[PDB]
Chain A
Amino acid sequence: ITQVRKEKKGAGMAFATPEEALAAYERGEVALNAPIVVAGRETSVGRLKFVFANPDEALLAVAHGLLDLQDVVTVRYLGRRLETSPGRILFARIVGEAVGDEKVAQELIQMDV
């Protein structure tokens, strides 16, 4: 759960998610490449919540028939608007409640690689 989800969808474009957001959701270009405004297909399931009681929408959507998990690229809220998938979030959440607060694992655990 961290070996990228890039399944090769192509490279489309939307005027801030109003075009290739619903059309591409039907056929071709899923949740991989494709850039829009700046980010990409990350705009789909914005996991809100906060550093209060872990990302609700995150693990919540994963449990149901939504987030495929296994790191499918998703925007959380944790401590800042990131791109980390709910998969890695679990890891940081496991070591979090384990010892004490993600404050330590956050500055320790990497994200780039």
Chain B
Amino acid sequence: EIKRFGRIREVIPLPPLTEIQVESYKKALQADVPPEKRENVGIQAAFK
């Protein structure tokens, strides 16, 4: 039973919706990343 009533469905909704959390421990928590790079933002940030 599929009575789709949606017109022109371009780009899907911004996934995975829970990006605020991902961009929280991936932007700040530069743990799973070689110390060779990475600026600040997070640990290495307040650390320096």
Does chain A touch chain B in the assembled complex, meaning CB atoms less than 8 Å apart?
A: no
B: which residues have CB within 8 A of A?
none
A: which residues have CB within 8 A of B?
none
